[PDB]
Design a protein around this ligand. Sequence first.
Ligand SMILES: CC(=O)N(c1cccc(C(=O)O)c1)[C@@H]1O[C@H](CO)[C@@H](O[C@@H]2O[C@H](CO)[C@H](O)[C@H](O)[C@H]2O)[C@H](O)[C@H]1O
Length: 138
Amino acid sequence: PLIVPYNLPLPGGVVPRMLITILGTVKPNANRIALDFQRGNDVAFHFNPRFNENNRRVIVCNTKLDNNWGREERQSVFPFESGKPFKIQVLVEPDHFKVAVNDAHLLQYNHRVKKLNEISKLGISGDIDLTSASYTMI
Ligand SMILES: CC(=O)N(c1cccc(C(=O)O)c1)[C@@H]1O[C@H](CO)[C@@H](O[C@@H]2O[C@H](CO)[C@H](O)[C@H](O)[C@H]2O)[C@H](O)[C@H]1O
């Protein structure tokens, strides 16, 4: 297994057709999960399942530029479950990140950070046991 928070280098940055696969298990009584695709200090794509935001489960997605969070994009489909194993697949497409969880399409996130070559690492954090994190080309 992998220590969380975990950094996955993305050598040479992201490109369309790159597929990131993450396997893990949500801890009991989880509060949050986060994926942070980073361009230096900036967060090109933040994907943040929140298990209890005012008694609602929601995924928040956003971008952080110069330490400022932008406009949140929120999705109430919520495919994660405390205590249970999951698979996240993030496919880089030309104009968005496309995310599927447990083989079902979840959401798309339009590229705000357009220098995809410079998005050179992925941080994986939160209330999970992390089994594996890797990438391939499709
Ligand atoms: C205005 C306000 O209180 N918040 C906010 C900030 C930026 C964008 C929106 C929006 O589009 O509705 C709202 C809240 O600001 C906090 C602090 O930045 C947010 O929490 C942060 O959210 C980012 C992702 O956006 C990230 O997960 C941070 O880790 C987290 O602290 C909160 O969600 C906003 O409601």
